[PDB]
Symmetry: D2
Subunit: 229 residues, 4 copies
């Protein structure tokens, strides 16, 4: 029915699974708990940070126990411990000072041996590149008016995402992509109401995407803590 929640969310969890560390999980920007519900299958100790009281309240009404909720902007958040897994998915592109957020993650929140799961929408996704060729988007890394209205301040590609992670002091351990994406979201949502594409086709786009990270819907950096003093 819905591309981001019914297709992308499940494949994002699948992409993270082989890298998850045992222990606890911090979900930054957990919004209404839609992704949290999927992570609860893997983690019994999840902390969620979200600035919207309303989103957080919605989450709290639909998730199982074992979640610690923190209603705060990231700059103001005082967390009680450090975390073995941290999830920052489709959040960084909303942040005015992304390097500062990533640096907090590296310096304050990641446990020793902990891993950051950094995922952003990808400037070089096939569907976007086609939109650029059609002249609907000026260029790949452009921020469209709709994206700006949604809160985006940039459109990452693997090059600029790893730059920001490196500038923050993180160690980028793995680079990958999630879901080979040749149609726009609005076309997916139409086509998914039909029997034209199978579940197996969607799995094939996930499998093939790993071979063409630069062309995927979302790009994925697995990062570990770097030493900063």
């Amino acid at each position: 029915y819905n591309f981001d929640f019914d297709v992308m969310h499940p494949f994002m969890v699948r992409a993270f699974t082989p890298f998850f560390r045992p222990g606890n999980l911090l979900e930054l920007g957990s919004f209404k708990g839609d992704f949290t519900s999927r992570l609860q299958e893997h983690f019994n100790d999840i902390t969620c940070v979200e600035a919207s009281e309303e989103a957080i309240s919605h989450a709290q009404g639909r998730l199982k126990d074992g979640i610690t909720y923190i209603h705060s902007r990231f700059e103001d958040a005082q967390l009680p411990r450090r975390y073995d897994n941290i999830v920052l998915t489709h959040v960084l592109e909303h942040i005015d000072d992304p390097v500062a957020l990533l640096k907090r993650i590296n310096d304050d929140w990641l446990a020793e041996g902990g891993r950051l799961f950094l995922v952003c929408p990808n400037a070089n996704a096939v569907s976007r590149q086609i939109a650029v060729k059609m002249g609907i988007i000026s260029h790949n890394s452009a921020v469209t008016e709709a994206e700006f209205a949604h809160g985006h301040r940039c459109t990452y590609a693997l090059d600029t995402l790893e730059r920001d992670a490196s500038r923050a002091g993180l160690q980028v351990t793995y680079r990958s992509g999630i879901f080979f994406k040749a149609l726009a979201n609005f076309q997916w949502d139409q086509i998914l109401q039909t029997d034209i594409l199978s579940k197996e086709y969607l799995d094939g786009c996930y499998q093939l995407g790993q071979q063409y990270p630069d062309l995927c819907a979302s790009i994925f950096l697995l990062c570990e803590k770097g030493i900063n003093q």
Copy 2:
């Protein structure tokens, strides 16, 4: 709508147009004249070779004048002159000895300065790679039962196509791809009956395909005559 006739044929002509030489044209394997109809817009002197007397007669009914029709197998064909442009589109994959056919083109049929437009379906098309990931097709360069039934003896990729052209003595001048293809024909044929995709989307697939020749529906080598004695 039909993908091959309504989408691929016009993009093939667009892909050829910047390279056409002044003079005449030989269309090898012209079948029922579906492609010949588009070539007529560019050339007044066209020669078609085709083994099926029914196809050739079908073509003769529908096309305009200014076509010389040669009813023959390629190995038997005795042509009255040499040709400034030679078109071999979706034919070589059907040939038991493709190097021998290409060698005839080089040695007997290409005029001095003439160009061969060699186009084959691509083993590495994104849609085919997805089918391979789904387990429908064993590997990219496999020939499926249905393909074999249609007459295919090979599934070329840029490496194996250039190999055969080189072995035939041709000079490969340009390598490219036609149409960034991430859906199968059967899905195109369904979706093209909807309004999900626009004509501009399809144009975008053609534009982007040029930047990713290996992932296109068909691959295209522009070849010139080499010296063989």
Copy 3:
């Protein structure tokens, strides 16, 4: 050995050859005539526009006859004809208003049926991408301090180059790349002094680059009048 002059120049002429129109040719930013010497093998009617008096003087004393020299800035150039082939190679990335120059080319200088051969250094060249992974360059389309000191005001990729061409009103007919480049120029200049790489290897890099336009040393748009 120079990578740009001894490797990139011949491969650019090879990439252009199948697209050349019969007729005349205009070379915009012809500098000291290094690339003009190679174009002279294909055309006997060449017009060269160059702003540097020393450069164009140097070309003049070095090239064969059949050349019209125009010592002018592009904004001031009064050309006597329009042109069947126009070459703009490693110039656009220096231009403060690149769309304005491309528009002049579309609207005034290209002949009907004419072709523009637009080539720029590629942000996404493998060598550059590696430099970016090393932390030497911030990101692919960055302009470094050295590049800026050389006059670069942007680092094009296929997306931004076609954007600017399209904004100028040109028709982008073909998109390609010239030379699969995994080493930096300075490493090439060194390595070319040795016997490690062959001329066949270099030809192979050219042939392979056509299959990976986004990863090449230079990107190449073939444009026609919109």
Copy 4:
């Protein structure tokens, strides 16, 4: 220097590191122990299977304690445990019935939760594609006479390697590549003796190769039990 030993080995361990399971490790086709010595930094409980008496003897001489050595062919090997990590690196391409070896791994040797690190030389490596363009090698997935003399029976790419792992009953969890490789081993060995390329350049090739798995020196499937 050696390219395979001094460059590829360390970058294979790096590629593996984020996927390693706690516990033990089985190295299939451990030869003279060059890769094993690197694995010893990560695991104290390693089991090595190697058919050559000379090779396995050499390894015992040069490695630390905490290695179990199994001098056997794969078809005869009777292993004492099942394993959390199994390494099969540059071996499968030599095996007459590769699906049968992968099935043994899936059905008998992998522990539940265990991971197979399957790595083969890549048909579509840039250097190899250049060699194909030069006419030295017929096509990317060919086996050359020299390769065949060295025991190669195929040249895998991502599509065929995943096909074979899938046919064996393995779950292919991740697909990646190791080292963006645009020069031939023999060119690397020469250039490595010079100062033209730094270790940071080589790290850059590793980092970039993850973004272009199909162009890498070797391809890497991380598999689990199906």
